[PDB]
Design a protein around this nucleic acid. Structure first.
Ligand SMILES: [Mn+2]
Ligand SMILES: [Mn+2]
Lengths: 612, 161
DNA sequence: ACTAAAAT
């Protein structure tokens, strides 16, 4: 044994994959003390001399930020004391897995360290935590040589991993400090506000004992969206439409419905005048005929957000249940990594191979074989964010081995994958325009030409209707009767889970692996209730919370504040700011705001008297 | 000279009572019908002007408007979208106009696309109607040909919140 | 008892 290097990955599966790819099939595997982390050993070359590679993995975050003693037990420190006087430390998360001791024992005697962690922002923090754990126990450097290394990768293919090993770099302390500052700020603000709220409202309003009222940079805006929807529903007054429609018949038992060019009229007398201008008539002339081709775009790659949206809108699944099922499928080895926000396929990918694997299931075998015979289509281009490749099938499952929820998710994933590589949908749309006296109506229809991804995603199909009769300009037809209909504008309905997710994504509230957690949190704190149709309905306590926050200080329930704080904190990452100089200022502004909030609580207090 | 000045303004179609004409301008040694017109186009028509709209025009038994007319808009409302959404591109634009001259108020309907009169047009704007205008059910039909828009601000005491 | 991040 001359020299050994150590590699750390963020998932055990990814660790095994990289070890297999770079070890060319020769491995020596061993089980560590944790029982969920494995150590792989193999020989190779690193920097001109033979080196023994030792590969291992850590499970997600290793340390989490918390308070010391005497301050983590409430009823002993004033909440305002937490803002700028409470000592802070880092303690292990998931203590059952002795990650720190495992890293020390497995890194003892190592010389070089290589970090195959994720390329996102929340990866370099794990990077520097691992360095703080491992650097104390390691052979001291010689001369002026660089020891710590980092690798950049996107996919888990042979060429990508080998090139990533070929070219290496260094980590970014200024990037890690941004995440550290965010953690500190979030913990301070949340623990400051929640304690005061739940210590004031609990003991003075009856049936809120043994209840928790929580505040934070995500839960509160999430509740704000739903209560804004509730207010909009509560403050809607109906109006009255007046739509005019008439029917024209050409052959016996062949009538045709028409639509007015001016869709709506809101004045009864005006509508009556238009009707009287049309009712006593017997001809129908033809003005113009239309015939254009069009295409329905094939779906892009699959993201976690779109998975959650479709699961909650078509399969009757909550976001947390969907995430658990997806994680189980990943662990068993049926789908790729299920927490990604990249919608662009990697350049090097065995698309043909993955498609050829699913060439035996009776549900889509014909389409798979036809695509393989006639050549596949290139995927639709999209956004890339490093991170991980999109969600694709890996093995061939059946109805039997999986059951219920797992199969219902697997079918949708496989169908989406097959559709994203198939052709488009081509349909011709024919619109014919008739003239009745002084007014003109139109009617439109569609007909299919060559179905594409519709053959695999029927719910996106083009409905079939009888083809519009062919006519030339100048033809005249008889009209049956011209009549009016009265309608009322409909009020909006409560938010659905899909709408809440798409509102969360654009404003920056939450992330790819926190939306289910936040939704489930606001459901567990009895802030909202899930009704029929997977609709989130605000309850009395949440309505009071937001209607008080707006009256007292409005930026708390405001989606833009999280984006503003993130933009301000990015300066630390870019190297154009100072850590303390930013953190102290951003904590001082919030401290002043909280000190105002505590003295302006009577306004929110006088709002719960009309309820519990 | 006012005897010929009245005939000139009538031929131009700017019908307005002689007392109002005298009020607008009182013989600065010359009528100067041009400056009379310019001064009028920034004056409220309710105070000054004669009554010439056909009686019971708001009923449904006139069916005709012959000769040229001058009218003043009062309120403009888009009857194609609810008051909640004052401009939604879900239906084509369609405007109802509340015009006046003297003692009688009349209602008009767009019936085509006219770019001259927009939702932002302030009240008091003067409209000239030329030729023959159709009245259907007490509603005046406003074709693009038989309209002329002449501006002028008198009291834009209107605020949208 | 809090908050918000990753992972199985
Ligand atoms: Mn990760
Ligand atoms: Mn992410």
């Amino acid at each position: 044994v001359m020299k050994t290097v150590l590699m750390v990955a963020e998932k055990p599966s990814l660790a095994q994959s990289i070890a297999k790819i770079l070890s060319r099939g020769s491995l020596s595997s061993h089980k560590g003390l944790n029982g969920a982390c494995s150590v792989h050993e193999y020989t190779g070359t690193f920097a001109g001399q033979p080196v023994r590679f030792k590969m291992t993995s850590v499970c997600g975050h290793v340390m989490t930020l918390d308070f010391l003693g005497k301050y983590n037990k409430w009823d002993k420190v004033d909440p305002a004391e937490l803002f700028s006087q409470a000592p802070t430390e880092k303690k292990e998360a998931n203590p059952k897995l002795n990650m720190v001791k495992f890293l020390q024992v497995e890194g003892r005697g190592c010389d070089y360290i290589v970090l195959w962690l994720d390329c996102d922002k929340e990866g370099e923090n794990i990077c520097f935590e691992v360095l703080d754990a491992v650097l104390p126990v390691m052979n001291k450097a010689h001369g002026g040589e660089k020891t710590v290394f980092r690798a950049r990768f996107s996919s888990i293919t042979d060429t990508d991993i080998c090139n990533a090993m070929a070219c290496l770099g260094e980590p970014d302390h200024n990037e890690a400090l941004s995440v550290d500052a965010r953690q500190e700020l979030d913990l301070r603000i949340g623990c400051a506000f929640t304690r005061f709220q739940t210590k004031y409202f609990q003991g003075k309003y009856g049936d809120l004992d043994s209840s928790l009222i929580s505040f934070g940079p995500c839960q509160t805006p999430t509740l704000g969206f739903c209560v804004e929807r509730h207010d909009k529903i509560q403050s809607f007054k109906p109006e009255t439409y007046w739509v005019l429609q008439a029917k024209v018949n050409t052959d016996k038992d062949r009538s045709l419905l028409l639509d007015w060019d001016r869709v709506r009229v809101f004045d009864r007398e005006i509508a009556q005048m238009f009707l009287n201008m049309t009712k006593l008539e017997k001809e129908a002339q033809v003005e113009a005929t239309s015939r254009k081709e069009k295409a329905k775009q094939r779906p892009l790659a699959l993201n976690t957000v779109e998975m959650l949206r479709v699961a909650s809108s078509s399969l009757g699944m909550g976001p947390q249940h969907a995430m658990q099922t997806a994680e189980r499928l990943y662990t068993q080895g049926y789908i790729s990594f299920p927490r990604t926000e990249t919608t662009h396929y990697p350049e090097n990918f065995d698309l043909k191979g993955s498609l050829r694997q699913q060439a035996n299931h009776p549900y889509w075998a014909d389409t798979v074989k036809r695509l393989l015979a006639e050549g596949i289509n290139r995927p639709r281009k999209g956004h890339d964010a490093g991170d991980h490749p999109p969600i694709t099938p890996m093995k061939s499952a059946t109805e039997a081995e999986l059951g219920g929820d797992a199969w219902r998710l697997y079918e949708y994933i496989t169908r989406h994958f097959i559709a994203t590589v198939s052709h488009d949908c081509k349909y011709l749309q024919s619109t014919i325009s008739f003239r009745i006296g002084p007014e003109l109506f139109t009617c439109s229809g569609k007909t299919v030409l060559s179905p594409g991804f519709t053959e695999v995603m029927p719910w996106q199909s083009v409905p079939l209707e009888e083809s519009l009769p062919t006519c030339q300009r100048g033809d005249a037809f008889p009209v049956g009767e011209v009549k009016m209909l009265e309608k009322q504008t409909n009020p909006p309905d409560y938010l659905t889970e899909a709408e809440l997710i798409t509102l969360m994504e654009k404003h920056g509230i939450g992330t790819d692996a926190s939306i289910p957690v936040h939704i489930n949190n606001i459901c567990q704190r009895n802030y909202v209730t899930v009704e029929s149709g997977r609709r989130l309905k605000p309850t009395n306590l949440g309505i009071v919370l937001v209607h008080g926050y707006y009256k007292i200080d409005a930026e708390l329930v405001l989606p833009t504040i999280r984006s503003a704080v993130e933009k301000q904190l990015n300066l630390i990452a870019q190297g154009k700011a100072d850590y303390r100089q930013v953190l102290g200022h951003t904590l001082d502004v919030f401290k002043r705001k909280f000190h105002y909030f505590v003295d302006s609580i009577a306004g929110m207090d006088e709002l719960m008297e009309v309820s519990f | 000279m006012a005897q010929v000045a009245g005939a000139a303004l009538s031929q131009a179609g700017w019908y307005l009572s002689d007392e109002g004409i005298e009020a607008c301008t009182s013989s600065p040694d010359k009528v100067n019908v041009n400056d009379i017109i310019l001064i009028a186009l920034n004056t409220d028509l309710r105070t000054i002007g004669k009554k010439f709209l056909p009686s019971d025009i708001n009923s449904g038994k006139v069916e005709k408007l012959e000769g040229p007319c001058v009218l003043q808009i009062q309120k403009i409302r888009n009857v194609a979208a609810p008051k909640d959404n004052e401009e939604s591109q879900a239906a084509p634009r369609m405007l109802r106009l509340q015009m006046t001259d003297g003692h009688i108020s009349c209602t008009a309907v767009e019936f085509s696309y006219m770019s001259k009169i927009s939702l932002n047009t302030p009240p008091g704007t003067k409209v000239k109607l030329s030729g023959i205008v159709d009245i259907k059910n007490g509603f005046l039909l406003l074709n693009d040909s038989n309209t002329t828009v002449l501006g002028g601000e008198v009291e834009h005491l209107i605020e949208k919140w």
